[PDB]
Amino acid sequence: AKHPVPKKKTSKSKRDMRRSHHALTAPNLTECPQCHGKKLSHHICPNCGYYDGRQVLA
Amino acid sequence: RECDYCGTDIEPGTGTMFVHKDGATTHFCSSKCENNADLREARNLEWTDTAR
Amino acid sequence: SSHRLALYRNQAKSLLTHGRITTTVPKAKELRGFVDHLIHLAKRGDLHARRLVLRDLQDVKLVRKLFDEIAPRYRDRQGGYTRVLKLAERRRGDGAPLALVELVE
Amino acid sequence: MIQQESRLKVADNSGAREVLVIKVLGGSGRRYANIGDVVVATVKDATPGGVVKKGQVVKAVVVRTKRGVRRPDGSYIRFDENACVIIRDDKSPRGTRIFGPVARELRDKDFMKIISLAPEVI
Amino acid sequence: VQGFAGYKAGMTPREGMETVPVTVIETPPMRAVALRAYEQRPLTEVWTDEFHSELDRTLSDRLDHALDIVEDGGEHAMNIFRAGEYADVAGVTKGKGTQGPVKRWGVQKRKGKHARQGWRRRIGNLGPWNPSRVRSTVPQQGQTGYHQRTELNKRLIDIGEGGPYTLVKGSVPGPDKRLVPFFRAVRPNDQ
RNA sequence: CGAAUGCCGGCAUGAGUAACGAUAAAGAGGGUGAGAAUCCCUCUCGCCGUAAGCCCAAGGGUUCCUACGCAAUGGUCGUCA
RNA sequence: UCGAUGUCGGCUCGUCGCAUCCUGGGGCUGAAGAAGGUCCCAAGGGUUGGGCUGUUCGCCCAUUAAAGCGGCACGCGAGCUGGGUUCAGAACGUCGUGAGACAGUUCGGUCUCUAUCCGCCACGGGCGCAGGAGGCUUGAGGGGGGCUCUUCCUAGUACGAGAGGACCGGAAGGGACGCACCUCUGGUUUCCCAGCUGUCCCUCCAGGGGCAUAAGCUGGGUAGCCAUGUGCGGAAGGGAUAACCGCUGAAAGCAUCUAAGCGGGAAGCCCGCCCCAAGAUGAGGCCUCCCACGGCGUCAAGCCGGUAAGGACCCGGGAAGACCACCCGGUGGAUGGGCCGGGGGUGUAAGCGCCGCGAGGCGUUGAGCCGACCGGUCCCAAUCGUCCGAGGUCUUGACC
């Protein structure tokens, strides 16, 4: 029942543009509180456990 | 009145009025009161101003 | 619906068992709203409140447990008996931001 | 309200019993009978042919409707029913005496005859 | 600022002689901001700070008496609007969103043998074969809720200051309370 | 030999949009792992229940247990099969 | 066009056009009035429910101002419809020895998920507008929206035999329609409250519990959303004109609106109302604020800290919402949830208490439990951190 399926090949080029608009952006991250390492902005880690409270492990 | 009877009451410094053929009436209030009343027998009604 | 409750249920429960838990962002936040108000009745303390909170979590051990157990610890505040804190990791395949929440202590 | 075939009843001895709307009078567009308005429609069933008779072609004015009409008194009114009166073009009822109670409306929009005969008015 | 403005209080109505509904509006005198004039070269808007204490958190009649209080030193109470006259008022929509041919625009859909049939809402058609392709016509699902809206003959009845507030005839202020509404009075017919 | 809606075989398309095979649901705790929403124990809960029961046979035919182990099969995982 | 363009009628969405049905402006009558009829000008808006018929069309019903003609493959099937004629049945009538057959008829008879492009509607991603900035407008251009009936004074006066019934001019009401909106009214209100049977767990009672859909059921129910409902609008008024009517006056020393000169006059055109809008590359205005960091070969208009001028990310929240972007908050907080006070909703709880063997009843109670609505207070959670982001191109001239 394929009423409409593309009529033309798609243009290598353009095709890719389409893809184009699409951009990767590494998670903003910030250095630790004191477990000194880099971390996911805002959170404890297998480095930390702090924040202001010792909740976590290792 | 009493909502006619409808010992209950409902809606503003207005309230509102419902009625019946034979130049006779249904002065009005609240839903509960409503359906029961429109449907069957006064004196058997209970809640409000008569089974009071 | 049936579900919303369900959850609020098992969770509220285990939660009281633990004082903290791992669910996902929202999961946590509302588990908060409610396990919380439950807590508040825990405070209320009495025939009635007891009745309600059980009405939902269903079970004595804990029911009273919360009630006589921690209700005290908190009897004083103004809600907030819960503190939800965002987690640093995401469950796989998924990518979901889990979180950890507790009863503030 | 009350157009197309909605049925409604008498309250005047005009000789009816009941009628099915047709037209909601007034002028094109238009779709509603409501106390005061005037409907065009007719006999579904009339008594032993008093003077009207079943399936008879008629015009009449709107007198009692549970569509609840609002009065410029931010106050509200509705009836356990739907009925009215028949007329001679010259907006006059035919039914010699009235029936169910009516609303100040009639006077308003021109229907004394009725107005007075009325067992009651609200 | 050429005009008079404020926000959405709420609507209710009560009293009068029969009984009329209205809406209340909020506004003491949201201060002076330059003063419209293509004089000597282009002169349009200036800002000799005299502002809030927040606002660097972001950093010829009508307008003329606006020169009056603007010069005064910023603000200028509202209610020039008096005992029932007609402003008019703009209000931003109310973000309704992206919708169906339906409420986007009154249109009968799926008649009955099929109104239902797991079939409903979706405008009916687009364009004759031979005329060709597509108008810029027939709207489409044309979002609503952010439109800048407003109307005419806005009769305002009364006001009072228990805070600078107005009571205007027939709400329809567009947006919801706690929202931005502006009023002028222009080209009155019911002048 | 473009060139026969060509035969053979690779290789791109839409396209990272469409689908996951019944709207009988999940959630928490701990356990094991290099790594587990997707395995193990465990406590909340939902669904059958005339069946989503156990049985005889038909058909298939080692698929079964037990220790190992995961490259592909398993429409994601997967230390589970 | 047969490696294929899907043929009726309907539907829904419509868009021209005029020979215009209704509208307005006209000149004409065998026009007094009034209403008619003749044609010219004008497409603004507007141009109803049934009825029977697969129908278009048509006939009839009741309205109306009207109930217009025709274009777009007799517009629309990658949008439905699919009644039909126009797949095998089959049926009759009807031809034909027959066989099948008939634009004669009659009963039934599988119209296919995923839009590439252009296109349209919406929402952001760039980059530009040559300092770097946050906030304010102007709008050329563009879009919406333009109807109408009745009632009344002017008058029952102009006309008039009379029954009638005015221009001109002005009040009101309503229709259908569009913008927007909850107050009022009505619908909602998937768990807010309340009554319920059947069942399994609850520990026996009571007092609950899931399931009885994805609320089992019923009786009700904010807030938002939304009519059936609230406010509203289609106008004045100005500028050029259509038809059409005049003045002034030749050429025809006598007329003529007339080529040149001036005005009269349309629901029309332009403007006015409202709605966008300089990505109108002719990047517009204005104000506010930030000042020339570095060291590298040069018309170094190329690479580094920057200025919180500012903004951004993350987080927290919105009738803001698919994403996105938009807007307000970010513990010098009230932003979200919590709590709390209020309404508003259910209708007097769970317990003991008393009257009746029981059923229950009445009390303690208008109680109890409460989802968004208004507004407190730092109970909880918006910590802390990071990025990027200017410097002022070349030439002419006007001033200090």
CATH 2.40.150.20 for domain D1-122, yes or no, is yes
> At E119, which helix (H) or strand (E)?
none
> At E173, which helix (H) or strand (E)?
none
For chain D, the domains span: 1-122
Spatial distance between the Cα atoms of C86 and A39, rounded to a whole number of angstroms: 14
Domain B1-52 carries which CATH code? 2.30.170.20
Spatial distance between the Cα atoms of E176 and C41, rounded to a whole number of angstroms: 36
**Rounded to a whole number, what is the distance in Å from the CA of D101 to chain B's nearest CA?**
5
Which residues from A are below 8 Å from C88, CB to CB?
A: 39-40, 42-45
**Nucleotides of chain G touched by protein CB (<7 A):** 11-15, 47-50, 61-67, 71-76, 78-82, 112-125, 134-138, 148-149, 174-186, 190-191, 202, 207-212, 214-216, 219-221, 224-226, 228-236, 272-276, 284-288, 309-311, 313-317, 319-322, 328-329, 337-340, 345-347, 349-351, 366, 368-370, 374-377, 379-386
Contact check, Cβ <8 Å, A39/C88: yes
In chain E, where do the E strands start and end? 4-5, 7-12, 22-26, 85-92, 148-161, 164-169, 181-184
Residues 79-118 of D with CB within 7 A of strand G:
none
Contact check, Cβ <8 Å, D119/B22: yes
DSSP SS3 for A17:
helix
Spatial distance between the Cα atoms of E42 and E60, rounded to a whole number of angstroms: 17
Which residues from D are below 8 Å from B20, CB to CB?
A: 79-81, 100
B27: Cβ contacts below 8 Å, ≥ 6 apart = B1, B3, B4, B6, B17, B18
Contact D19, D44 (CB under 8 A): yes
Pairing mode of beta strands B16-20, D92-93: unpaired
Residues 24-43 of A with CB within 7 A of strand G:
28, 30-31, 33, 41-43
Q: What angle do CA D112, D115, D117 make, to 5 degrees?
A: 105
The length of chain B in residues reads 52
Nearest to D68 by CA among B40, B14, B36, B9: B14
D30 touches strand G (CB under 7 A): yes
Q: To one decimal place, what's the resolution in Å? A: 5.5
Residue corresponding to tokens 């099929």: E114
Residue corresponding to tokens 């130049």: B23
Q: Is E168 exposed, middle or buried (0-12, 13-18, 19+ CB in 10 A)?
A: buried
State the method: X-ray
Nearest to C31 by CA among C70, C73, C82: C82
Cα dist. E49→E27, E34, E37, E95, E124 in Å?
21, 11, 20, 34, 57
Contact check, Cβ <8 Å, C87/A51: no
**Nucleotides of chain F touched by protein CB (<7 A):** 12-16, 25-29, 35-38, 43-46, 76-77
Nearest to D36 by CA among D62, D56, D2: D62
Cα dihedral sign for C70, C73, C75, C77?
negative
Domain ranges, residue A14: 5-58
Nearest to A43 by CA among A57, A24, A25, A30: A30
> How many Å does it take to go from CA E174 to C1' F1?
75
For chain B, the domains span: 1-52
Q: What tokens appear for E123 in the block?
A: 């405008």
Q: Which of the nucleotides lies closest to C59 (Cα–C1')?
A: G202
Residue C79 Cα to chain centre, angstroms: 12
Q: What tokens appear for B46 in the block?
A: 């209970």
Residue E43's CB is within 10 A of a number of other CB atoms, namely 12
Which residues from A are below 8 Å from C98, CB to CB?
A: none
Contact check, Cβ <8 Å, A42/C100: no
Contact check, Cβ <8 Å, D80/B16: no
Q: What tokens appear for D76 in the block?
A: 């509200």
C86 touches strand G (CB under 7 A): yes
DSSP letter at D102 equals B
Q: Give the closest of E13, E14, E18 to D73, CB-based.
A: E18
D112 touches chain B (CB under 8 A): no
**Rounded to a whole number, what is the distance in Å from the CA of D117 to chain E's nearest CA?**
28
Q: Is D100 exposed, middle or buried (0-12, 13-18, 19+ CB in 10 A)?
A: buried
Which residues from B are below 8 Å from D99, CB to CB?
A: 21
Cα dist. D89→A20, D40, D59, D102 in Å?
77, 11, 7, 20
Residue B10's CB is within 10 A of a number of other CB atoms, namely 15
Chains adjacent to A (≥3 CB pairs closer than 8 angstroms): C
Q: Give the closest of B16, B17, B23 to D119, CB-based.
A: B23
B47 touches chain D (CB under 8 A): no
Domain ranges, residue C44: 1-105
> How many Å does it take to go from CA E19 to C1' G227?
22
CATH of the domain at C11: 3.90.1030.10
Q: Using the C1' atom of nucleotide G71, identify the protein residue whose alpha carbon is closest.
A: E131
Residue E12 Cα to chain centre, angstroms: 19
Residues 9-28 of C with CB within 7 A of strand G:
none
**What's the structural domain count of chain C?**
1
B33-36 contacts: CB < 8 A, separation 24 or more?
A: B33/B3, B33/B6, B33/B8
Q: Is D103 exposed, middle or buried (0-12, 13-18, 19+ CB in 10 A)?
A: buried
